[PDB]
Design a protein around this ligand. Structure first.
Ligand SMILES: *[C@](O)(C(=O)NC1CC1)[C@H](CCC)NC(=O)[C@@H]1[C@H]2CCC[C@H]2CN1C(=O)[C@@H](NC(=O)[C@@H](NC(=O)c1cnccn1)C1CCCCC1)C(C)(C)C
Ligand SMILES: *[C@](O)(C(=O)NC1CC1)[C@H](CCC)NC(=O)[C@@H]1[C@H]2CCC[C@H]2CN1C(=O)[C@@H](NC(=O)[C@@H](NC(=O)c1cnccn1)C1CCCCC1)C(C)(C)C
Ligand SMILES: [Cl-]
Lengths: 305, 305
């Protein structure tokens, strides 16, 4: 028993991390096969960032403008192209340490592991959620750009995130591995609102099921509710609407605990209306929303990779 | 910016994990050189666990009673010995994937990364603290025994923890890699009190410095305090005494923020006496005590491995 914010084991991703330098800018890239993926703003000067013409800037770069480094093996770049907001550097060596992998785009409310890197070297690994407003609450310092987010399913690394930038609120924005931003953001230095964040309701319910699996069940009540009447209370507390598809994805946890999803909804309704009255759930004084139903099942059933 | 419970990158440890079977019992071992370390209770039956005579039980085992498995490479055991509460299986193959490493014993309040494993395969990685009462608040299911805790310093894995057992409160107990339990526990199935847990004061202060580094500084006040008068208030809230050595280890964070350790103590004093008045610090409604001063520096300075 116990319940922790648990990341995926990171070894497979560790062996794909490299250092990419262009001019004065050094950040991280992802070395899969003979390709290094990194944020396209590696090519920019401080002055270029106000409204970069990335097509023109890249046209003025040659292969030898890009220094790629795998620890010491100084990779030779033989090609460069741009896909959306990511640069792809063809190199003369295909990464031996290349794991099996896909590139996927996660949905708001889904979770992933971030391998935070500096200079192509891992600092640490942590879990987080894609927020409904398509930001993530990461831990990223200058030089962290090109750090990636990923999930592992069987033996296959699904890359879902590459880090590009920090908003003035201290939250983080980036792209999938085809270089499309999550959310409304563009890679230029302008004020860009993230828009209203909401609480990931399906995930709060998942974590309440986690609490029950772990014998912490004080918040269970005799009341029940319809999905509609639940959503009327939840919308008042800036919670995301709960959909039938969310109710379906909570089924496993419902089945395991014998608590119907709408009875857990009735529990969350009272927590929202009353607060916790200085009690805690799985050590927390706040309702936690960065565990998916699958995270709870993974962790409470000991799924391995 | 941002501040997350961050684990060490786990790849180096991943390649040391193996499956150890003795009779009906399968758990994890740590494969370093030609030695596999695992909990000695792998040799026990359900009935043996009331008061096992581990010397006599081990004497009745032969090398071929122990099935060691690295994925599929079925390791042949050529020796078995006992050191305190850990079994050492000499094998015919030394692990190629063997990283550089030490075995260390951490102090109460220090943190480490746990690589949770089942059947010699990683499930996930998370951070936790050795509690003052020498338990850890882990996430461990049946089959997790032999999962290890570790830190990385330069390129050297310091192993500090091997998982043995769960207390009826849902907290966890284990040994260092010389097989000595943390805390008063013995590997037999008897009621064993953990004793009073306390809040890791030096770590709360470290996390308040983290909050200031991240622009969350509402709790800073004009008041100050002596170390003694701080400890008079803190002892009332079941906080660990703060020592001059703790004050010294907070020096870096004091220097970086220009807030004297005793001025941060004066901030914590009011938080304890008043509570947070429904405010939060780095997203939390509770005071967090599972970051060390070095964790805050590591994470706020982007130290890599
Ligand atoms: C990353 O590339 C990296 O690690 N580089 C290695 C060090 C050499 C780097 C890491 C910063 C922590 N990312 C960036 O430099 C990005 C790029 C891409 C987009 C613009 C530039 C600057 N940048 C940022 O992350 C910045 N953030 C902003 O500029 C915000 N701007 C504003 O909020 C704003 C407000 N008023 C006027 C003008 N801008 C972002 C910009 C993008 C939309 C969201 C808001 C800093 C300031 C470096 C965090
Ligand atoms: C671990 O070996 C493993 O992963 N084994 C693989 C599955 C085959 C296994 C994992 C359990 C989650 N650990 C254990 O089996 C340990 C060993 C070592 C010490 C005794 C046995 C049983 N065990 C436990 O972790 C148990 N915990 C207890 O028995 C507690 N006992 C009591 O609190 C108690 C209360 N009243 C009367 C008698 N006992 C522990 C025992 C040690 C001191 C602290 C309290 C279970 C119940 C399996 C969690
Ligand atoms: Cl909290």
């Amino acid at each position: 028993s116990g319940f922790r914010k648990m990341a995926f084991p990171s070894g497979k991703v560790e062996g794909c991390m490299v250092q990419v330098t262009c001019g004065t800018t050094t950040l991280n890239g992802l070395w899969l096969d003979d390709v290094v993926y990194c944020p396209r703003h590696v090519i920019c000067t401080s002055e270029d960032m106000l409204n970069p013409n990335y097509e023109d800037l890249l046209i003025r770069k040659s292969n030898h403008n890009f220094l790629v480094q795998a620890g010491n093996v100084q990779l030779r770049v033989i090609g460069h192209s741009m896909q959306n907001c990511v640069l792809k550097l063809k190199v003369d060596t295909a990464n031996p340490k290349t794991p099996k992998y896909k590139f996927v785009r996660i949905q708001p409310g889904q979770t992933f592991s971030v391998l935070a890197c500096y200079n192509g070297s891992p600092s640490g690994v942590y879990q987080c959620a894609m927020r409904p407003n398509f930001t993530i609450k990461g831990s990223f310092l200058n030089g962290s750009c090109g750090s990636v987010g990923f999930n592992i399913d069987y033996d296959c690394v699904s890359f879902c995130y590459m880090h590009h930038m920090e908003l003035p609120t201290g939250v983080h924005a980036g792209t999938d591995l085809e270089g499309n931003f999550y959310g409304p953001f563009v890679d230029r230095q302008t004020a860009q609102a993230a828009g209203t964040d909401t609480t990931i309701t399906v995930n709060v319910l998942a974590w309440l099921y986690a609490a029950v699996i772990n014998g912490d069940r004080w918040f269970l009540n005799r009341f029940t509710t319809t999905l509609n009447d639940f959503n009327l209370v939840a919308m008042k507390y800036n919670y995301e609407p709960l959909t039938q598809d969310h109710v379906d994805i909570l089924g496993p946890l419902s089945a395991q605990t014998g608590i119907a999803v709408l009875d857990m909804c009735a529990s969350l309704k009272e927590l929202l209306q009353n607060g916790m009255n200085g009690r805690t759930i799985l050590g927390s004084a706040l309702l936690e929303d960065e565990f998916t139903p699958f995270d709870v099942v993974r962790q409470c059933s000991g799924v391995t990779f």
